[PDB]
Structure formats: structure tokens, C-alpha cells
Amino acid sequence: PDTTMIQKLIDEHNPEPLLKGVRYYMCENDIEKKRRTYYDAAGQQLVDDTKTNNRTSHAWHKLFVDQKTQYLVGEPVTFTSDNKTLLEYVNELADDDFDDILNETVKNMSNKGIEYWHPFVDEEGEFDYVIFPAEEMIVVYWGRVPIIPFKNNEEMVSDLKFYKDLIDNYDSITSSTMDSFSDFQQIVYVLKNYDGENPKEFTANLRYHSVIKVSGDGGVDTLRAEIPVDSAAKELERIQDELYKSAQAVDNSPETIGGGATGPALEKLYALLDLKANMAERKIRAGLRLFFWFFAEYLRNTGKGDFNPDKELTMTFTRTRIQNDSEIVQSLVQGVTGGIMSKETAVARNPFVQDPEEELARIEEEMNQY
């Protein structure tokens, strides 16, 4: 390879698109660049120390990403195969530290648009994997190339890409309104046909005595800032609703309407995130299958057996989904009593059951006693 092309690849590379989502996840929004300006003598744009420059950046993106991460990977991934030796080795590798890392990957892939992570044999000779921050990686196209991509989309943009317009707007409005609250304090006086000749007399005479002296037919008008709380609040409300839509998220704010408890009502609530979860699963599995291919290669060469993950091993994702356990249990009891259902299927579908194998077995031993 060449050392000169290396420099081109480095100097042509830019991490500003991939860091975008990371900066928003941290409440470093473009609104932090807001500054309150004014114009000099010959129109020189200048910041002015006179006025407070509030710039509020909202944690919307961090909320949505976290929600997505936890939904897909909060519960550890389960694995099933008929090849038990393989099953053992996979479980040994991937069921505790793996979980905590895969969690960091999904958040990362949602902030960066892509997350790479690299497989490598330890100094002790054991198999290991470390996260390889995509904003340090440069890609152009063991046997195959030695890194594992986890793609967020096909487009490999951050989730932020589809709603950054809204977060920015939300921030813009909030801060504007904040400035208005600050400016409301500083009252501006209009002095019509003022009595005193001295300028000193005014500022002292108002500040230390209640009085402002005025002659002629004049007086004192005050100019106070208007605070646009109402209009701001009205718009913000919409932006807020759209935000959830645009981000395919769930809003479990309490339902004003007295319906939200029912099966369909709940299903509808999660509809969009369920949309967003499925893609992300497809994309996560893609990366993970390739990950177990590499682990299979390691096992072939370390002399621990030759395996085919892509055809032998099956993965199971679990979803933390709000249900109406009371409703389900009844539907199930009706179902079985009706005889449109096996107790087997029923027990597995029962919300208070973790492992259908153990419970199906527990119910039989109960009967053989009673």
C-alpha cells in the first residue's frame, strides 16, 4: 500500500456528518451557535453584551434513540440451534458483556448512521471483539475484509436526519421565548418634554427616589417587551406531535381520552416504533450473522469444530411491549374454554409466563397430585 494515498483518504475524510447525531444525543444542538447581534457605525455585525443570549437545546434525539435501543436490545438476544456444541460456544461468548456492548452499538448506529466493530484474537489466544468507532473508519471495496458493519439504514444516515429540522425549530422557538422573558425585565422609558436639564439627575432621581419630574404637557411612556408565550406554546405543541411521528417513537404521556387501556389502543400506540424496530432488527441481524461467521472461522482454525451459523443457528429478539395482561388472560381463558385453543398455545401466550417449557410441566405435576 501507499503512504501518500493514506493522507488523501484522511484529509478527504470528514466526521461532521457522523458526529451530527452524537452531538444532538449530548444536547449540543446547532442552537448553541445562536448569538444576539446588532450593527455598528458602518454596518459591522456585532454580538452585544447588553442582552442575555439564551440557547436551549432539547434532548429529543437522546430520548428517541434510547427508546429504540432498549426496545430492540434491552432484553438480551437468545440463540437456538440443534447443534448443541455450537450452541454452547455461542452462549459462552455472547450473553452478558456482549449484551452491554450490543446496546452501545445500536445507540451508536443510531447516532452515527453506522457502527463498525472489529473481531480479533487475544494475546491469550481467545476470541475477542471491540467496537471500532465508525467516525475513525474509512472503507472502499480471514478470507473476507476483517471488520463488521452494523448499518442503521440503507442510507447509513443517523436517525436524526429525518427530524433534525423539527428539533432545531423547537429549540429556536424556546430560546426566542426565553430571550423575551429576559427582556421583559428591562423596561424602556420614553421621556416626552422632560423637565430636567441634567442627565445625571434622571438616573439617580428614579433609582433612589420614586420620582420622575416632567414639565410642559409631556409625560413618561414605558416600552415593555411582549412575550409570545401563547403563540409559541400553540406551535410547539404541533412540532411536538410531529416530532414523535417523524421519529417513529412512542409517547406514553397519559391519555386524556379514556380509551388507551385496550388491546388495539395499545397496539396503535406502538405502531410507529414497531415500524422502526423491524427495519433496525433486519439491519442488526445482517451485521450479527456476519459476526458469527467470523466466530465460526475462529472455531474452524482453533480446532474446536467446523460449523455453519447461517444455516444452523437461529437468533431471537425480545420486545418490551406494554400489554393489557388482564385482557389477554381472559381472551385466553375464553379461547381454551371455547375450545378454539390448546392449553399449550395458551400457556406460551400467557403474559405471566417466562419459560413455557417449565410451566407446561408444572401444571401437569399439579394435576397428577390433585
For 274-287, the DSSP string reads: HHHHHHHHHHHHHH
* Whole-angstrom Cα Rg for the chain: 31
List C-alpha distances in Å: 306 to 91, 147, 287, 297, 333. Answer: 17, 21, 21, 8, 47
Q: What is the DSSP string of 264-323?
A: HHHHHHHHHHHHHHHHHHHHHHHHHHHHHHHHHHHHHHTTS----HHHH-EEE-------
Instruction: State the binding partner of 345 from its own copies, Hg ion, Ca ion, none, CB within 5 to 8 A by kind.
Output: its own copies
Contact between 165 and Hg ion by CB under 5 A: the answer reads yes
Nearer to Hg ion, 171 or 297 (CB): 171
Run of H or E residues at 112: helix 97-112
Residues 117-136 that bind its own copies (CB under 8 A): none
Among 57-65, 105-113, 217-225, 298-306, the segment contacting Hg ion (CB under 5 A): 57-65
Q: Which helix H or strand E contains 160, and what residues bound it? A: none
Q: Is 59 in the site for Hg ion (CB under 5 A)?
A: yes
Residue 261 touches which of its own copies, Hg ion, Ca ion, none (Cβ within 5-8 Å per kind): its own copies
Q: Which is nearer to its own copies, 6 or 117 (CB)?
A: 117
| Of 232, 171, 180, residue with least CA distance to 52 | 180
What is the CA 184 to chain-centroid distance, rounded? 36
Binding to its own copies in span 182-201, by CB under 8 A: 182, 184-194
- Binding stretches for Ca ion (CB under 5 A): 55, 165
* Binding-site partner at residue 74 among Hg ion, Ca ion, its own copies, none, CB < 5 to 8 Å by type: its own copies
Specify the stretch interacting with Hg ion by CB under 5 A; choose among 122-130, 164-172, 279-287, 296-304.
Answer: 164-172
Contact flag: residue 27 with Hg ion (CB under 5 A): yes
Distance from C-alpha of 171 to C-alpha of 29, rounded to nearest angstrom: 8
Residue 165 vs 237, nearer CB to Ca ion: 165
- Tell me the closest approach of the beta carbon of residue 112 to Hg ion, in angstroms: 18
State the Cα–Cα distance between residues 238 and 56, nearest whole angstrom: 19
Asked if 147 touches its own copies (CB under 8 A), the answer is no
Query: Looking at beta carbons only, is 165 or 344 nearer to Hg ion?
Result: 165
Q: Is 152 in the site for its own copies (CB under 8 A)?
A: no
Min separation Cβ 243 and Hg ion, Å: 9
In angstroms, the CA 96 to CA 86 distance is 18
How many CA within 13 A on the CB side of residue 136? 7
Nearer to its own copies, 137 or 353 (CB): 353
210 binds its own copies (CB under 8 A): yes
Single-letter amino acid, residue 331: S
Scanning residues 338 to 367, which ones bind Hg ion (CB under 5 A)?
Answer: none
Q: Tell me the closest approach of the beta carbon of residue 167 to Hg ion, in angstroms.
A: 9
